[PDB]
Design a protein around this ligand. Structure first.
Ligand SMILES: [Cl-]
Ligand SMILES: [Cl-]
Length: 278
């Protein structure tokens, strides 16, 4: 892995990001969910790097990246991604993928950096903003995690993050996810919770998208259910919708091979070298 100070248009202007960068050629950036880290995309990074250059950062406040206290807006996280791509000399187009909060970041990136997208991968996410109660629950989480740490978040979220088959067949996956949550920096968790609460409604952004989009959801996702994600996909032009069987909210971890294959086959169609040159 790498750790670099990048220049970002968001406050505070410079931030240290930890990231993986594996493979050569056409760039695919994968953005983790809340309150996880870059390791949730490990299988896809390790497999897709035979064909693509896969960049997987820890977002501000997560994993090994710098923690910026206050509010970490989705826009700021997108600005950081643009700054990372700038640092790396990836100033043309990328494919940007995100899961859950990472999807929110992807929408913020599409708003501001549309000409930098060859494609979007939206996993287990939604375009609507938080409802008022959901916003308040963000704030409650933020205020508590600063003091108590994320154990209470793991307790609440783990049963909702993965399907029954994952608990049975892959207890090691459950434990990896649990350790991601338990290790998440408290002030980073708080800042991102507050940022999610104030994110805009991206519903109307979707019909205005101008790149191919893959929408992926676990069959048993309890947080962003497949029915809702299918409806979201029907608002996005040039979309492909895939349900991953026997996965909940975290298909990349729960059904890694199925996710890798879905992404690989779509990338082959959408993210070509001639498209990069011209
Ligand atoms: Cl957003
Ligand atoms: Cl909500």
């Amino acid at each position: 892995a790498q750790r670099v100070k990048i220049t970002t248009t968001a406050t505070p202007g410079e931030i240290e990001l930890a990231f993986e960068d594996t493979g050569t050629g056409l760039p695919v950036l994968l953005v983790h969910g809340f309150p996880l880290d870059r390791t949730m995309w490990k299988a896809q990074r390790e497999e897709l790097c035979d064909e693509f250059r896969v960049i997987v950062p820890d977002l501000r406040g997560f994993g090994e990246s710098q923690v910026i206290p206050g509010v970490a807006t989705m826009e700021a996280m997108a600005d950081d991604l643009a700054g990372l791509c700038n640092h790396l000399g990836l100033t043309g187009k990328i494919v940007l993928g995100g899961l859950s909060m990472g999807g929110y970041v992807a929408f913020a990136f599409a708003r501001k950096y549309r000409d930098r997208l060859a494609g979007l991968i939206l996993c287990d996410t939604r375009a609507r903003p938080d409802s008022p109660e959901a916003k308040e629950n963000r704030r409650r989480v933020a205020e508590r995690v600063r003091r108590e740490g994320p154990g209470f978040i793991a307790e609440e979220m783990i049963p909702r993050l993965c399907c029954e088959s994952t608990f049975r067949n892959h207890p090691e996956v459950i434990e990896k996810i649990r350790q991601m949550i338990l290790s998440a920096p408290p002030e980073g968790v708080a800042a991102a919770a507050l940022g999610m609460a104030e994110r805009p409604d991206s519903t109307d952004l979707l019909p205005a998208l101008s790149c191919p989009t893959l929408v992926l959801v676990g069959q048993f996702d309890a947080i962003s259910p497949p029915e809702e994600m299918e409806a979201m996909a029907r608002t996005i032009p040039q979309s492909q919708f895939v349900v991953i069987p026997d996965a909940g909210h975290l298909p990349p971890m729960e059904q890694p091979e199925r996710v890798t294959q879905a992404i690989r086959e779509w990338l082959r169609k959408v993210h070509t070298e001639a498209g990069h040159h011209h």
